[PDB]
Amino acid sequence: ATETQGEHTFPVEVLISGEELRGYTAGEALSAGEPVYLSGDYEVSASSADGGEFLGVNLYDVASGEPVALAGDDCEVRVEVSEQVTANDEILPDGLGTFETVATSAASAGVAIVQEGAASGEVCEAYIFAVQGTTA
């Protein structure tokens, strides 16, 4: 995810605020800002759609098997949305490396709250407030 100044592209800093940065092994190659979930013992993988799969967002690009830093509950983050979002939208993993609204998904509860709105395919600012695991 990127910001433009003149002719230049700069990478966005995925983290705005928070101390809840935690370490996992990557179960696959991951890109900064992707939502991820537990897929093995201390191992994280890219989240699929419609909930039950979110521990946090990957903070820097990693190859498979590398140690990944991840931001979770209490963190405030810059993340790319799949669709237009507005302040107070709940959002969750889209299955495409982006987020989308709870309203759009088949799920009924989100993982982050949009603090600053964004158009499709660009960065919102959001606060991560929950994790989702396998409830069956």
Partner 1 sequence: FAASDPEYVDTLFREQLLEVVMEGRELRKVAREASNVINANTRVGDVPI
Partner 2 sequence: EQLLEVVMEGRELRKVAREASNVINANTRVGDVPIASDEEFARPTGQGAEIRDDGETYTTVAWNATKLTEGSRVTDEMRDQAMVDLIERNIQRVGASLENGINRVFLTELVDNAQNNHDTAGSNQGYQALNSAVGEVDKDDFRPDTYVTHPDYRTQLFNDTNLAYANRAGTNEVLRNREDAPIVGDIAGLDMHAAMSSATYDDGTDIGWSGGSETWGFSSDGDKGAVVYDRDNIHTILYAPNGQDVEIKDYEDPIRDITGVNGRLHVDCQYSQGRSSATVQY
Positions in the binding site for partner 2 (CB under 8 A): 19, 21-25, 40-43, 59-60, 62-63, 65-70
Instruction: Name which position in 11, 65, 121, 133 contacts partner 1 (CB under 8 A).
Output: 11
- Six token digits for residue 134: 């396998």
Indicate the residue among 15 and 123 with the shorter CB distance to partner 1: 15
**85 near partner 1, rule: CB under 8 A:** no
Q: What strand order describes the sheet that includes 123-128?
A: 15-17, 76-80, 123-128, 112-116, 90-93, 99-101
CA dist 44 and 30 (Å) reads 9
* Partner interacting with residue 32 (select from partner 1, partner 2, Mg ion, none; CB below 5-8 Å by kind): partner 1
**Residue 13 marked in a binding site:** no
Rule CB under 5 A: choose which of 28, 43, 61, 73 binds Mg ion. Answer: 73
First-to-final CA distance of the chain: 33
Query: Distance between CA 54 and CA 46 in Å, rounded?
Result: 9
Shortest distance, position 86 Cβ to partner 2, whole Å: 30
